[PDB]
Structures are given as C-alpha cells and as structure tokens.
Design an enzyme around this catalytic site. Sequence first.
Site, mmCIF file in Angstrom:
data_model
loop_
_atom_site.group_PDB
_atom_site.id
_atom_site.type_symbol
_atom_site.label_atom_id
_atom_site.label_comp_id
_atom_site.label_asym_id
_atom_site.label_seq_id
_atom_site.Cartn_x
_atom_site.Cartn_y
_atom_site.Cartn_z
ATOM 1 N N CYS A 1 0.821 -1.298 -0.065
ATOM 2 C CA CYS A 1 0.184 0.156 -0.140
ATOM 3 C C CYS A 1 0.987 1.107 0.040
ATOM 4 O O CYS A 1 2.115 1.149 0.062
ATOM 5 C CB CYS A 1 -0.880 0.070 1.347
ATOM 6 N N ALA B 1 3.337 1.667 2.860
ATOM 7 C CA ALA B 1 4.368 0.980 2.785
ATOM 8 C C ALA B 1 5.354 1.930 1.841
ATOM 9 O O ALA B 1 6.569 1.918 2.096
ATOM 10 C CB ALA B 1 4.385 -0.476 1.833
ATOM 11 N N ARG C 1 12.646 -3.997 6.419
ATOM 12 C CA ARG C 1 13.613 -3.667 5.282
ATOM 13 C C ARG C 1 14.832 -3.127 5.916
ATOM 14 O O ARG C 1 14.917 -2.579 6.748
ATOM 15 C CB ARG C 1 12.773 -2.477 4.831
ATOM 16 N N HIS D 1 5.186 6.708 -2.545
ATOM 17 C CA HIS D 1 6.417 7.157 -3.077
ATOM 18 C C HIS D 1 6.359 8.722 -3.285
ATOM 19 O O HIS D 1 6.830 9.631 -2.733
ATOM 20 C CB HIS D 1 7.140 6.627 -4.200
HETATM 21 S S1 ICS Z 1 12.477 1.947 -3.585
HETATM 22 FE FE1 ICS Z 1 11.033 0.664 -4.323
HETATM 23 S S2 ICS Z 1 9.852 -3.326 -3.941
HETATM 24 FE FE2 ICS Z 1 13.095 1.439 -5.689
HETATM 25 S S3 ICS Z 1 9.438 0.274 -2.926
HETATM 26 FE FE3 ICS Z 1 10.601 -1.420 -2.904
HETATM 27 S S4 ICS Z 1 14.548 -0.606 -1.821
HETATM 28 FE FE4 ICS Z 1 11.886 -3.093 -4.475
HETATM 29 S S5 ICS Z 1 12.573 -2.914 -6.539
HETATM 30 MO MO1 ICS Z 1 11.284 -3.973 -2.121
HETATM 31 S S6 ICS Z 1 11.086 0.542 -6.409
HETATM 32 FE FE5 ICS Z 1 13.698 -0.071 -3.778
HETATM 33 C C1 ICS Z 1 12.042 -1.116 -3.934
HETATM 34 FE FE6 ICS Z 1 12.559 -1.161 -5.763
HETATM 35 S S7 ICS Z 1 11.274 -1.938 -0.762
HETATM 36 FE FE7 ICS Z 1 12.866 -1.979 -2.338
HETATM 37 S S8 ICS Z 1 13.257 -3.887 -2.921
HETATM 38 S S9 ICS Z 1 14.743 0.056 -5.631
#
Ligand code: ICS
Lengths: 478, 477, 522, 522
Positions: B59, B62, B93, B192
């Site tokens: 969501c 997140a 994360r 974002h």
């Molecule tokens: S921010 Fe995005 S889903 Fe760019 S929400 Fe997600 S730490 Fe992924 S593909 Mo989790 S747009 Fe980063 C991402 Fe990529 S959390 Fe991380 S790996 S490079």
Amino acid sequence: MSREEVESLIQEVLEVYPEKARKDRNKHLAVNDPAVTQSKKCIISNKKSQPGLMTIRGCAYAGSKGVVWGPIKDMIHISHGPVGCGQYSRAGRRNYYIGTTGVNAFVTMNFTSDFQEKDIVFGGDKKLAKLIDEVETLFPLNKGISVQSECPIGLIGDDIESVSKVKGAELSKTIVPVRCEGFRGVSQSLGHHIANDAVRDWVLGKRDEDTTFASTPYDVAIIGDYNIGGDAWSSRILLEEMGLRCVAQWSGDGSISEIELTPKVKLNLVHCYRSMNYISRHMEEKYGIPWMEYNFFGPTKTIESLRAIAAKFDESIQKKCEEVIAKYKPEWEAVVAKYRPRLEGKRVMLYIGGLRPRHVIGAYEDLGMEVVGTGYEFAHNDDYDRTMKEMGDSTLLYDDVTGYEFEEFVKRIKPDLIGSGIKEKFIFQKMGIPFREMHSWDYSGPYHGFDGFAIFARDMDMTLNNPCWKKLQAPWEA
Amino acid sequence: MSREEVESLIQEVLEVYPEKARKDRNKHLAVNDPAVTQSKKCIISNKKSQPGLMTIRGCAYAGSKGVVWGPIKDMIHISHGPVGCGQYSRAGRRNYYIGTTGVNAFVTMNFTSDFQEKDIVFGGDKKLAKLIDEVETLFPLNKGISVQSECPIGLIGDDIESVSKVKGAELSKTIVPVRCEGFRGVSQSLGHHIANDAVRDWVLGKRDEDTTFASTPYDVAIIGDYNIGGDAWSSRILLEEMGLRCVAQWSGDGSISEIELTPKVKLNLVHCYRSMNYISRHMEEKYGIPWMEYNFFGPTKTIESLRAIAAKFDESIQKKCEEVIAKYKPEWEAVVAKYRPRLEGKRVMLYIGGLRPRHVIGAYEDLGMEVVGTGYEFAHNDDYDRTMKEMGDSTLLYDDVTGYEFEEFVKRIKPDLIGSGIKEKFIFQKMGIPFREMHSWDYSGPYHGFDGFAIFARDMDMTLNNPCWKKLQAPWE
Amino acid sequence: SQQVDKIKASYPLFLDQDYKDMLAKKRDGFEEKYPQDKIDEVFQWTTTKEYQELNFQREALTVNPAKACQPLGAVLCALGFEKTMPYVHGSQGCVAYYRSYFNRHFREPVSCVSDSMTEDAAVFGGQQNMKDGLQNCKATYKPDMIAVSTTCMAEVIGDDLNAFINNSKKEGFIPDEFPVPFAHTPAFVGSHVTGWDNMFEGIARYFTLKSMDDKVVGSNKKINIVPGFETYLGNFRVIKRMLSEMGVGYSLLSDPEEVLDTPADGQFRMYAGGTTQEEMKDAPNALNTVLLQPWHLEKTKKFVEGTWKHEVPKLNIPMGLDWTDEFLMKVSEISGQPIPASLTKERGRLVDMMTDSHTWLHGKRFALWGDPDFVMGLVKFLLELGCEPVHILCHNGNKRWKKAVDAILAASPYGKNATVYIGKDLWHLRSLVFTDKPDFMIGNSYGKFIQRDTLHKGKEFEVPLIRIGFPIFDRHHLHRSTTLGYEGAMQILTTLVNSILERLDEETRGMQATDYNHDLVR
Amino acid sequence: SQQVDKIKASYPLFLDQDYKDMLAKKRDGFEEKYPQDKIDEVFQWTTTKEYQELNFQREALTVNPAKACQPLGAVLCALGFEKTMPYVHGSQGCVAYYRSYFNRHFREPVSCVSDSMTEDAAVFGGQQNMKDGLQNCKATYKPDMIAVSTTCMAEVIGDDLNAFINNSKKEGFIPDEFPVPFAHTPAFVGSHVTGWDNMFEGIARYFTLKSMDDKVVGSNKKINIVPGFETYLGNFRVIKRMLSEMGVGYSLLSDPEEVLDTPADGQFRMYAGGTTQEEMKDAPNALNTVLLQPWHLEKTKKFVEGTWKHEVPKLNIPMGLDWTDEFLMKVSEISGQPIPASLTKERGRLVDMMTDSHTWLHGKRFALWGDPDFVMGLVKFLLELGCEPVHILCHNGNKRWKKAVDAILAASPYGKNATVYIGKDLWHLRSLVFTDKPDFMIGNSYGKFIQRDTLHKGKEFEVPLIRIGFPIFDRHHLHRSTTLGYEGAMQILTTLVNSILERLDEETRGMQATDYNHDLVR
Ligand code: ICS
Ligand code: ICS
Ligand SMILES: [Fe+3]
Ligand SMILES: [Fe+3]
C-alpha cells in the site's frame, strides 16, 4: 529414631546378605553411645570391601592423583597406564587454582601414556622416558613432573623409580614416581599415604640446606585443603586478616615451590587429617614443626579454630583474632537470622569420604539442623574416634556403606536431606528426598569460612525447601 | 521457449479466470518484441489490482513510511493509526544506518499512536498533539518528526496538517504530515509520490535562501538508494574515489540535514527512478539541478555509469574515473573467473517492485546467466519502456502478477533460479527451484558496486549449486 | 575491496579502513550529528529511574508495541480449516503485511487474499469488491471455503459483511451452498488474539447456529479442543498426541499444523490438513469444549455455552506441571478415560528434570512478555521451577487477567518481587530491565534490541534474551518447538537452564581471570 | 565478605578487591611464578605452526584424549538388558569412575558392581572374588542376569572368566541356570566402543551358540537392531518409532532407554525395561540383523554372520539424509513393508529445513570429533548441508575407517579442504584450530577448554563449541536429544544454524559499531 529401633533396622537390612557378607557388614554399622569413647570398642573400619555389594569407594590412584597430587598446579601429572583412569578423573574434582592452563598450569589437563598391549608385553619404561622428553618440549614452563601409576604398572614389573632418577638428573628436573596402583590398599586412603611419602621422598627436602627464605614468627601452612570451589581461599583470607602469613596451601591452588617452602613455617594447620596427617607427623619429627587440627565449617567451628590457632602465637595475633571475629559477626548472624528458621529441625544423613562426614556437623547445627546419620567411605578408627564426639547419641554410623544399605537406611529413617556423592544423588532425588552433593558442593561453594557459610546456608535452603519436592506424586495417583 | 509458445502459455493460464478478470489480466502480460519499443503499445501498468487474486503489492503507507521516510535516521516517524501497520513493517526492510538507536537514531523502532475505538469516535488530533510532546520529552535528540497516516486518518476526517503546523511552531520543530493512507492509489507507488511531495513541501525548502554551506563543483547527491544491506555505502565509496563529494543520500543512512543540503549540489544521481523521479524533477525545475539515471548492479553497468557520471564534470574527474576502474578490474575479473563458469547458461525469472526487475539484469549477464522473465509489482509504463531495451527478445513480461500466474509460468518455463520476495520464496523452494530474495538480498549484500558484485555472485552460486536441490525426490518416490 | 577467496558481506566489509573513513567524513561533513559525549549523556539518562518515571507517564505515545492487529489472528484461525482461503475485505496493504509477518516466523508459504478496496470504495462501499473478489478467489485458488475478515478501512466505512456476502450469492457470484463465514475484525479494538476469537466464533456460528435442533450434547463422544492463537507447531501436535495416548476422542477446531509444515518434495501445496467442515457442523454433539487459551477466547466461550450448551471447564492453559496435571484430570473426567501409564511416566520424567536442574534455576530473575495465556503459563512454570518472574508485561492484557496473575504470584514465595504490567510496551520494559535488572529476558525477537541497549551500558548490565513467543524472526525453526504439556515444560526447562549455563560459561571463560570457575561438570 | 540478600558463589566472590589482593600476595610471595611476559610468549608460541609440528611429532605422550577404556562400553551394553547388573571383575576404583562418568552425562543412577580384587588377588587370581561377588550380587540386588567384564588388572594377571564362572556354579555360589554371560575387556586394547562390541558378542554367544539347531532364519519375521555404544536417549526412541511407523517387526538388542530415564515419582527403580533374555534366545530366527554403528561392531558382525547365518546389510549409520534413506530402503527390502507416507513427509520436512537454512550454513568450516560412526555420519550430513568439515578427528579410529571417510569427502566439493586424523587427541586438535581456524567446533564438553584457549588469543580467533557427542557434562538434558534419522538431522541442523546466528548476533551487537547488521529478520 530410638536406639533399639536403629539396631533392629540394622539386623533387618543385613538379612538379605549371604552369611560371610552379613558377618562382615555387621562390624561396620553401629549406633552412637556417649558412654563409649573409643571406636576400637564399637565399629571396624579401613578393611577391604566385600565383593559384589556396590561399594562407593574408589582406589589408591584416585587418592594420589585425583586428591593429593593432581591439584598441584605448576607440575604436570602423568596418568601412567591405559587411557581410562586419567579420562574419568579429568577435571572431575573442583580443586580450584589460578593459572594459565596449558602454559604454566596444568590441573584440568589429562596427560597419559595411553598404554597399548605392546606396553603390557614389553613394559612401559622406555615409553615413559620418551614421554618425559615430549612433555619438556611442549610444556617448557612446567616446574616438575609426577608419574601416577595405574593398575598394570606394578603388575608387569616396570621400574618408574629408575626412569625418574635418570631423567630427573639428565634434565635437572623434579620427577616424582608415585606407586599408587589402584589395586593397592582397600580405598582412596592408601593413595593418600603413598602420595604423602612421595612428597616426603622426592620434593619436600629440596631446600633443607637453603637459608634464603625470609621467615616471620607468623608463618603457617594450610595442610589438607584442596580448595574445592575456592574453600582454601576463603580460609586463607581469614588467617591473614588475623595477622598470619600463609606460606603454602597443600594442595589446592598449590605450587611446587610452596611445598618446598613448608618446612620453613612455624605451624602446620591441618584441615583434612585423614589425607595429610602422615606428612604433618613427618614435618614435626624432621623439622620440629608443630601441627594442629582445625575446622572452618560454620561460624561456631571457625571462631573456635581462629581462637585456638591465635593462642599459639602472641598477643598481637590474639587481638587481631577478636577483630576478625567481630568483623564477620554481623555477616554470619544475618545468614543465621534468614536461613535457620527455614531449616531448623530438619534431619540430615551424610555419607562422604574421610573428613567431611564429621567436619560439617557443626555447620548444620549452626542452622538448627540435626545430623541423624553419618559415615565414611575410607576413614580409619582415629576418624571414628573424633566422630563419636561430634555425633549425637543414638545416631547411626556406617563405614563403607553398600548401595543396598544406604537405600534401606534412608527408607526407614526418612531424613529431610541427604549429603553424599554423585553416585548417590540421583537415587535419592527419585525417592523425593532433597540431596546436596557434599564432595563437589553441587558446583557451588566455597563452604569454608564465614563467606562459605553464607553459600552453604543458601544452598541447603534452596534444595530442602524447593517446590519440586512437593510434586513427586501425580494427583490422580492418590 | 519460443515466442508462440510463450503466447500460448499466457492464454492457457488465463483460462482459469472469470471473464472480467481474464480480460483485465490479459492486458498485464506480454512477450518482448524488438520491433516494439513503446510499452504503451504492448502492456498496461499502474492500474488497480483485481480483487481476490492474491496480488503481491503493498500500500501507499508502505511506499511512504516503509520505503521513503522510514530510513531517515535522525527523525522519528509516527505510524498514526491502529497498531498493525507499524508493527509489521518494523525493521523488515534492511535500510542500513550508522547511529545510536533510541538516542540519536530511531530507524528500527516502532512509534505509533495505537488508535483505539475512542480515537475513531472522537478523532485522533488531540492524541497526536499529546504524542508529539511525549516524543519530545523522551527522545530529545530527534531532529524532526514525521506523521505517516494509516487508513483511518483520512476516513474519519482528522487534520494532521493542522496539528503539524501548530505543534511545529510551538516547539520550533520540523513536523511533517504525510497523507499516505493505504487506501490511496493502487500500490506502494503512490506512496512514493506522496512522500516526495511531503519532502518538497515540508523539508526540502528549509535552506532555500541559506548560503552557509561551502559548495564545490563536484557536489552530488545519491537519490533513490535506501542502502539495503549497505548498498549505498558501496556506491558512495566509488563516487568519492572518483573525486566527487556525496553531500546527501536519499534516504538510506540519510539525515534530515543531508536532505536539506541537497538543493546545493551540482548533479542528482538517481538510482531508483520510480520512487524519486518526482523530487528529482522538482529540484531541476526549482533549483536548476540536472539529474541522471545510473546503475551500479554488476561491473558492466557500474563502469558505464561511472564513465557517464564523470563525463558531466572535467578531465580531472574523468581521469580519477579511469583510476577507479583500473583499481577494481582485477577484483571483479577474479569474481567472474570463479563464478561465471558455475552459473553460465542458467535461466532466471524475476519479480520485484519498481526498479530492480530491470536494473539487475546486467549483473546476471555478467555471470553468463539469462533473464527469461521479469516483472514489477507497481511500475509505470516509463519503467517498462526501459525494461524492453534491457530484456531479451521473446522474454515474458508480467505486471502485478497474481500468485496463480507466477506459479503457472514457473511450472512451464522451468527457470533455474527465481529472484523475488518473501511471500514467494517458500513456494518455489518447495517446488525445488533455487530462490534468492531480491528485496532483502536474503540478509546478505550489499549488491551495489564492485564490492557488492562479489557478494552477489557468491550468493547466486551458493543457492543455484547447493546440494539441497538434488534431494527433493525420495529415492523410493 | 574484496578478496575473491574470502568475500565479506556488510559485516565485516564496512569495518575496513576505507569504509570507516568514508563514514566518518559523511558524518562530519553533512549529518550535523550531535557530539558523541552528548549521545553518551542522553543514553545514560535513558537508563535512569528519572527517565523511567517520565516513560511510564506516557498516555498517547506507544513505542515498540508487543501486539499486532486483529486480522492477523483471523488469518491464522482461518488457515486452520481444510482447504480454506483467508480473505480480508478491505485494503491490500494489510494482506501483504500479514503474509510477510507469518512467512518470516514459519518460513512457509502463507496464503491470504484481499479484495483491494481503494479510495472510491470509501464513498460507495465495498460491495462490488466482495462480489468479484469471492468469484475470483474461488475460481483461481479453488478453496472449499472462504473465511472473511476486515481491515480497518472497511470497519471505519461500515461495510456490512453479512449483507455483502448474501448479495454475492444472490447475484450468482458464488454458489449459494459455498461456505463463506465472516467476522468483523477492527484493528482499533483489542489485538491479534481478539481477531482469532472473532474469526473462530464467526466460523462456529456459520456452521451451527441454524441447525441446533438436531444436536444432542455428548452424542459423538468427543471433546472439542479450541487452541486459540498458536504459533508453535509442537503445541498442536502435543495436544493431539496426549489425547490419542489417552484414547480420548477429540476434534481440534482450527488446526494449521499441516499447512504450516508441508514437505519440500517438488510441489507446492497451497492447502493441507485442517479442521473439516463436518467437524465444525458436528461440534455441538461433543461432550464438551475445552478452550486452551481462555483469556482471548471469551466470545467463543459465550457462543459455545449459550448456543451449543457445553459447560466449558474452568481450565488454565496446559503449561507447566500443575496446569498440565489439571488439564489431563479434567479430560479424564469428561471422557471417562483414565490417564495412561505413558503420560504418568512423562510427568515423572519432567519432575526428574526439575530435581536435576533446580540448583541452577533457583532464584533466577526474569523479565518476560507475550500474549495473556502464554505469559501466565510461563509465570506459573517459572514459579514451579523456583524462579522469580520480576517483570511481567502483557501489552494486550486487561485488569481481570492481571488480577488472576497477581493471585498466582501471591500463592508462591517466588512471586514476592514480581510486578504485572498491562498496556505497557517494550520501551517501558527497557526501563525496567535497566532500573531493576533481571538475569534474563524471555520474549520474542523484538527483545534483541533491549539486550543490545543493556550491553551498551556495560557487559555487567547486559540482559540476555531467551527467545520464546511470537514472532521469532532471527533464529530458524524454533516454531517447531513445543511449550504446552509435559513435553513443552521439558523443552522450556532445558532452554532456561542451558541459557543460564551458557552465560556462566561466557563469564568464566577469561584465562587466569575468571576461568577458575570454568567447570567441566555443571 | 557477604551481603546476605545477594550472596556470591566463587564466581564472582573471588573478584572482590580483598580476595584479589590476597591472591596477588600468595602469587608474589610463594609461587615463584614465571613472569607474565614469559607466560604470554609461551602461549603465543603454542598457537604457531612451529608448535603444531612438534605437537604432531608426539609418539609416547597423549594429552587430552578423546576416548575411554573398554569396560565403560561393556557396562553400557549390559545396562540394555532386562534386570541385568553390570559386573566388572577386577578393581573397584574402575567401577567408581564408570558410574560417575555416566552419572554426570545422564544425570541418572548408574548401577554397576565390582568384586574388589586387591594386592592378594594379583598374585593368586580373583577366583574367590568371583564366587563371593556373584553370590553377594545376586542375593543383594536380585538381578535376573549378571554380565561380567574385566578391568585391566584382571586382564594382565590372566583371570579365566569362563573357568571362574563355571567353578562358581559348580561350587554352589550361584544357581547353574542363572545367566552369567562374560567378555574380556582389556583397557589397553581399542576403546570404550570395543568393550561394547565385546560385551554384546559375549551375551549373544551365551544365549544362542549351543541352541542353533532348532533355529530357522526369518521364521519370527522380525529384524534385529544392534545399536552399539549410544548415549542419546532419542536415538533409541527414533529407531523404534520409525520401525513401528513402518509396521516392521523388530527386536532392539541392548535397549537402555528405560533404565536411563526412570521417572522421579517417589521410588528408585534399579532396573527398568531392557532387552529380554527371550528376545536374545530368539534372535537367530529373525530375518536379518542390522548394525547401526558397524565400525565398532566388528566382532558382533562375525558372530551374527558366522553363527546366526544372517547376511548383515552393508549400511552406514542412519545419520543425515542419504544414509537414513538407505537405512529405510534396506529395512523395506528385508521386511517387505513399504516406507509409509509419514516417513516420506518427515523426510520432505527435513529437506524443507535444509532449503530454508542453506544460505547461513553454506561454506561454514567445522572441526569435529567423536567415535568413528558418529563422526562419519556428522561429516556426511555436513557435506549435505554444504558445510566444510575441515578438521575431522577420531582418536579411536583406524586406517580402514579413515579411507572410507576420505572417500566420502572426495565425493563432494565441500570435502576439498578436509583432513581426517586418527590417533590424535584434543591437544592436536587445539593446534589445528589455531593454525587453520574453523568457524565452529562440534564435539563434547572437553572442547570447552579449546574454546577458552582460542579466546585468550583474541575474540577474533575464538572458535565456539557446539556440544554434540559424549560426554556432555556442562549443559543439562542434552542426552535426551536425537542425532539419528530425519528427526536427528532436523535437530542437528537447527543447532548448527542457530549457533551460527547467535554468534553473528554477538558480533553485531555493538551499538554504533557493528549493529548496522544486527538484523531483526535472519
Ligand atoms: S525504492 Fe522501491 S519493492 Fe526503488 S518500493 Fe520496494 S529498496 Fe523493491 S524494486 Mo522492496 S522501486 Fe527500492 C524497492 Fe525498488 S522496498 Fe525496495 S526491494 S529500488
Ligand atoms: S582429601 Fe579426601 S571423598 Fe580429605 S579423599 Fe575425597 S576434598 Fe571427600 S570427605 Mo571427595 S578425606 Fe577431601 C575428600 Fe575428604 S575427594 Fe574430597 S570430598 S576432605
Ligand atoms: Fe519452510
Ligand atoms: Fe535425572
């Protein structure tokens, strides 16, 4: 609880035995009587065990290597024979020490010649000589080697004395041959004696001609404290607070140099009479050093011992004695105020080795407990003499008790606590009887001195009053 | 598999769906074609998920709290709402940082207003004000607070902007209201954007007229690196070996002061386009700062990026660029010499978020592996434009894949390795397919830069060639 | 830099000198960091009683909670039923988090769907999401049952689950006979364990409320077992094992042990095992219903007693010696089966272990937290072991539960220094372990940050964590353990005594300093 | 000094300043200690490759062995028989040590008698000791059987056990029909495991040699299982559980699990369970006999094949995945029973755990020791996990065994850096873990002293001990664990991965230093 009840209990238990064993064991069981002072009139001891009856005793190697020599920290002790003895005795006894193990101290290591059949056939004397050279290469800071003989050494006709003399001279090193083969004697006791004589013959006289040691009128040695859980340290601290200078500890945390310095002291303080009376008598004959027995179990005995020891010196020591007693008085009084109510009236049965079965009675009595039975694995008649004065009237005495006897005595007497060894512990816990290990202190302690009494009291309370003992019976049984 | 084989697979899988879902999902699955470059002509993306099909998406909270704001280390981030969201996202994360947690850094802590029904009935604005005062007394070294709104905040009509303005003035503190309620948008992606706009509106302009910071011609900012397992640190070390000064990291190991200094840099280096292109576009509009995309996954892309970045400066930087490349050449060449033979020819399927499904292809190819399928949870069409140039011809592309689709594609394509998320990992391990987490790096990494490539190669090798995969079948069946 | 023959991950890579200098320059250059002496001063202050009093005056702020929200428990409950798909009506972000949370604890697939309500549904409701969601879910993942709960969005806007489900059937989106039990599970009420209670009661009601007229209590000769929120596989298995050993007929209602432990044999099994719909339909015919965790099964109890007419026994969670004893004796009374020799022997083996280990456990001081039934069972067993549970924290506890625990503490000398806390979080607990230091913490993985904090004050102040509870994320396969019954008590006792001995070995490992007490035999 | 409300034991009592000063005075005054700089220099020298070269040149000196003597194994074998008293002909000191050694590992009573031969018996033999010993033992402890072995004294002087026992019966000291199997168990040959083999073969001969003519192989449709020297209760239980799950009729020959795990219920049970004399008499009628640890059952094998005419299968110890698979498949072929779904599922759960944990196990380097079968099974499983067993020590191993292990290592890439050592002790191993440092040691409690040594060099050189083997004296209740089968593999895997993760947590617990990698989720 009465004399007549106890004597009939003895006869009932003995009915299971074959005739020969029955007649023998009857001589090793007795009921205390204040009208009889000499044990030479009521109990036999220090005889061979009857075959097949599950004695608790060990062997002479245990008494020499495990008890007397093993604790000496800067020497290397060789278990000379097959691999077993040194392995079962590796670090089993908590004779504590300060050192860098593997470098300058070696107590918890197991050095052995690991006899194979070839060593049985050809003798092990050439292996011993090679072994000594290997020790010197890999352990250069060792300050002496002892050779503790296991059963086969004497049976195959090896001459470890000759190896020790030759290699000792070659290397300018103290190398002590000890003929403590497990088949000698009847118990650990002869191991003590054999080991004492080895100290006398190979170590104790090294500095007879030396006049270098700066002596004082207050020099003493602690004889027969093996520092179980630190016992000797909590004893030593009191003696030096009293103004004495403890030159040596035999052999808990002991160094070979302390041993060699002991003939220079003014008084030998013997805690364990059984294991060290031999060398103490020797030092009185050869060097004129008096010796005295003492007891640091519990405040009553510790105070009594401090004052008796101090009486052997001058006014300054006797004054410091009363300072020490006053210092620790509030401490052990707080221990008694807390724990005596939690233990008073509880009945204890003990079975231990050669000293503690009598020496700890005072500490139990300082907590209001009663010792209703006690006995030794390997005591002699002079030990039982001292025991009759400590034990109460009509209490049960047992020498070299069998597994069957101990179980059956406990079933009838129903003590609140048992104090004995590792081979007894798990039997009586299953019966629901609180148990304290009185060799290893159940990995607690120290128990000597004022600081040890606090731990002793805590330990008896936590076990006697533990919630687990209320739970042995399932409520549907239910 | 051949193109026509892949098209038949798509139709076969779609047959299970009800008519409405089938017509929709058909639009989110495609086969790459080198004659087709514009994604708007072959795949749709960034639309609502179909109900009940087990999307992998999260969501907007997140995307805002977990992704953009959460890593900022010296700020306290308030999960404003009921207790759940902040707890599930606590330390999930691996946005790494240097700090004294609980004292001057707060990243792995969970601050929340723990809404009760009374807060639903009477509103949570007085609770939020009281909360902020309690934060101030117990965490005095915090350098700012953010308020990350969970679903109920917008639904009950709370006004966190007003609380933030009032309390901000009363305490002289930066308090950032973020309207990232999970019901907004269709995925993490709108989070974002919301978070980028909150940075712009409440933080980024603080030093607009400030001139205190001494700038140099080599000042840059790393935009869109969240330092997963230290990824940003293994990137920064290279940029600074090349003679640049990395003034800021957005937002892995990031401080609020670094963000406030970013309007002073000469160039914005954008790693994750998806999450940070918004603020990059803003800083170029308002401050005239150019931005450029780069890629530090694997030696080929890292070298290419270093050289492109250096070209934006002068000869001295371009000279230092070649120094860095020569320094690390024996290191990554030893990695390929060791691991490429153990991995060459192996086929990989990826499914990740908004950047990595295309950004890591080069690193796989540097080890001789082939990416035969890839897709995004929440990418937009500009991401897919960039993807078709990276992916091979006739490879499978899937947007917002369903659990059913992913399993069925894997059964037919039979990849040697899958790279995806925690919700996928244990499914494919049970099928006997080596799996690497490509979000958390499976608690390894970094994977960025030259130092990360060594770890990346080690990790793919240890999993692909592990003895456990030969044992799934009992010898008696 | 990397040496190809010994590749470094983040630890210890970033301790290399060049990374250290880079991080120092970043700090000094751009972070505007507080000076280290100021950080040390504030850190020291956070360990004081003065800070603790401020900390415990919090009313609005929660820091490091020790609870989750209702739908997590509803998902876990639903997973315990045969071929059942958990279905959370509301926003999809929630479901991603639920699945991830359980994925990381169980290291297993966790299946759950959302119907992806968005901004627009807030205006016109989520009816269409439910109709398409149910049809899509049933067609795609072929469950035999869909168990519906709600996210907080759907609760706030007031979607009527019953009406929406009835309309989905009426309009043909799913067959009328397809089972779709439901429960409202508002995140702003109670906690995850409340969600379990609500989901279970919803499922029980779905299968029994309208068919009571043919039911006869005791006619199937079984005992119903309701486990509650349970995240140790061994706890499901030991209850089944003990009842089978007794020859007691039983139905475990909500049994996820199979679906959370499928083999890796080359195929993914979305569903496995679980309570059947028949077991739920037939549950009113049982002799009685036993609730294994009654402090979060209140709603279930009211339904089982009010509708099924079972006289739910007053039993504590079967943890430790006494409460396992009581559980077996009540099962024996209800079923008419005697306690067999095998369970009597197991009891005596646990008691034997207690006697063997009591000297190392006696007086050991513990801080602990978790869910209410788990916590009070741990408290009870610690008191049986002669330990002192000094800090007892249950974030999701209530006054009535606290009184029951306080009564358990009052009945034993080992509870004299214990305090029970409700509504406090792990930042409160952090202060307690600084100001009134225990010997160990017993809790979930979030406790590792408290141990880190205590060590920063000093090695002599470190409080090591013993991981028992939920979630455990930073060790592998502890979810396979057991905490219930004699078996669980044996496992817990072994973990506790050996944690004590591991720590003593650490403290006595110093050559010529503390290794005089580095005993071979303990 | 002591404060009554916080009493100190030796640790940390002796760290008080006054004890510290006292101990310094004792040292300086009378110990004539080498200066500390010399101690440090020698210690550093003991960690070098030059020291290792001298160390491995030893021929006569053994330091810190990793084996015991034969009678220990004879006693353990004898305990596995119903109402059987172990009886060691020879000196009593040996029996005190055997009982204490097992007391400390099992925390249970251990019953064993001696006939207390002394100086006199050394010249004229122990015949009278045997006559009185056997009579006394039977009357006092009422065993159904007395199993006789020897101490090294009795071997050296040459007491003829057979003759002495026959004369005891002839002269009326015990009934002629009372069973008195015997075996010569010389301590200077082999090790404790040889004593087990010798005792078992002695008991097997006593009950079968002279009655073979009515025996028919396979007529009782069972499989015999000989466990060998086994000190984990779980290993007896898992073999029985798996065979019962398969529906395989079996006879476990020597089964001490009951007598080593009696309940604490208010009575002491000297005997419990065990293999019956009837089961031994009937063993030749089995289909076949499986040896669970064939590398120390050589003599037993020769008797079972030469006299019972069983074609003993060539099977490795059932440890790890492949060798458990092979065990079950061979049992299936012998018995005609299929491997049931429950065991197939358990296998797949172990494989699932392996996939879950493989990234933390991969490449981890281990030093390990133990008895030959245990060690080679541990080696095999480590290779299956993708670990590297770099230092493999078996003090009581032989050349034929070392070649078998080297072939196992050669079959895997993960054996590339491994060396197998036979006849080396733990002082040899100490050098290896200094000069070629592994990540962990797997071994018994004696390894704790090596871990202490490595830490003294420095925290970065410390090699933590993982306790698996015999004896374990400094933790409680690990003798209840399992190392065989899928269950044992699961336990070992869990211990290994979580030992790895606990150490990583320790290394990353430093605030603002290494806690960037102090991950909640691993
Ligand atoms: S921010 Fe995005 S889903 Fe760019 S929400 Fe997600 S730490 Fe992924 S593909 Mo989790 S747009 Fe980063 C991402 Fe990529 S959390 Fe991380 S790996 S490079
Ligand atoms: S030496 Fe003796 S058996 Fe005096 S052999 Fe034994 S460490 Fe005992 S009663 Mo173990 S004569 Fe010491 C003894 Fe007493 S080993 Fe210890 S506790 S005071
Ligand atoms: Fe798994
Ligand atoms: Fe026990």
